[PDB]
């Protein structure tokens, strides 16, 4: 039908899920434009995967994300991870491997947590 992938991100108990497909660059979280994500002070924490690679990369794809559990802060860290992982997975299948690793180089230079969950867990009894 149409080229598409789905990927997920984790933080502590939040679980973001993202669908990516070909289209016209729009990014929505729970049906609302990403410019409205809250709290305000953390909003740049979500722009990172966009500004770090450059907006030109998104013009041909639609991202929509749902976030479910956790808390106000932990679920912000979930969605940024789901976007980054989603973006490389799309390139990995539908363009060359060269551009795929070009993306990774940018992300892992800035912050490892964009791709890999931090693996901290509550202390047992």
């Amino acid at each position: 039908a149409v080229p598409s992938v789905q990927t997920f991100g984790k933080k502590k108990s939040a679980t973001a899920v993202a669908h990516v497909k070909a289209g016209k660059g729009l990014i929505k979280v729970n049906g609302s434009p990403i410019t409205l994500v809250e709290p305000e002070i953390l909003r740049f924490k979500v722009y990172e995967p966009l500004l770090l690679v450059g907006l030109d990369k998104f013009s041909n794809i639609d991202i929509r994300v749902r976030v479910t559990g956790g808390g106000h802060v932990s679920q912000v860290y979930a969605i940024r991870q789901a976007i980054a992982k989603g973006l490389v997975a799309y390139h990995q299948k539908y363009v060359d491997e060269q551009s795929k690793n070009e993306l990774k180089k940018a992300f892992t230079s800035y912050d490892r947590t964009l791709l890999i969950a931090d693996s901290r867990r509550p202390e047992p009894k």
Partner: protein, 201 residues
């Protein structure tokens, strides 16, 4: 420039950040310099960041916290007394307002003023109990820790039973300590430690 329209329009002012990372999208890390050669390795100002909140874990290896950016090191020490524990988002807002004030009282790049206060305030000699006391030298990492603690403690006490807000008093401390001004709480504390050490050496 690169306006690059999208079906969800990102505001112009965010697109302009696409070229260089600025703290709070406001001030540049470029041309910030640690003026004392002894501290260059211990004041992280080289990796830029957008906002002073990170998940990073630094407790696991004993020198690893030297890599944490100085602005985040500062925000942590505001979260101090028991009524404020865990309230980091409160602390982040305080820093955001503080840098603004320093950009109006005086006119330097405010992140430069912070670096001056840190380097200028850390004690350089101390004492230990043997009873009697003996004078000893102090290591560069501890110099940074002492500076941060003295600065925020002075700010906290100045703003208790106050009229000025935390941001007002923290801003005034930093400015006075970038100068050699003894009016700042932290400068007085440094002097007493060193003159006592001189007496006992």
């Amino acid at each position: 420039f690169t306006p690059v329209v999208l079906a969800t329009p990102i505001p112009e002012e965010v697109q302009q950040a696409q070229t260089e990372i600025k703290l709070f999208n406001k001030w540049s890390f470029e041309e910030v310099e640690v003026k004392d050669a002894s501290l260059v390795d211990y004041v992280q100002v080289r990796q830029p960041i957008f906002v002073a909140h990170t998940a990073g874990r630094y407790a696991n290896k004993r020198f690893r916290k030297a890599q944490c950016p100085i602005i985040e090191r500062l925000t942590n020490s505001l979260m101090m007394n028991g009524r404020n524990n865990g309230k980091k988002l409160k602390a982040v807002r305080i820093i955001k307002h503080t840098l603004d004030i320093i950009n109006v009282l005086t006119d330097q790049n405010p992140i430069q003023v912070v670096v001056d206060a840190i380097t200028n305030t850390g004690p350089r000699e101390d004492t230990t109990r043997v009873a009697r006391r003996q004078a000893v030298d102090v290591s560069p990492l501890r110099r940074v820790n002492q500076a941060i603690a003295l600065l925020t403690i002075g700010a906290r006490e100045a703003a208790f039973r106050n009229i000025k807000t935390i941001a007002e008093t923290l801003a005034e401390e930093l400015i006075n300590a970038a100068k050699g001004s003894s009016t700042s709480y932290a400068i007085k504390k440094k002097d007493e430690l060193e003159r006592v050490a001189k007496s006992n050496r």
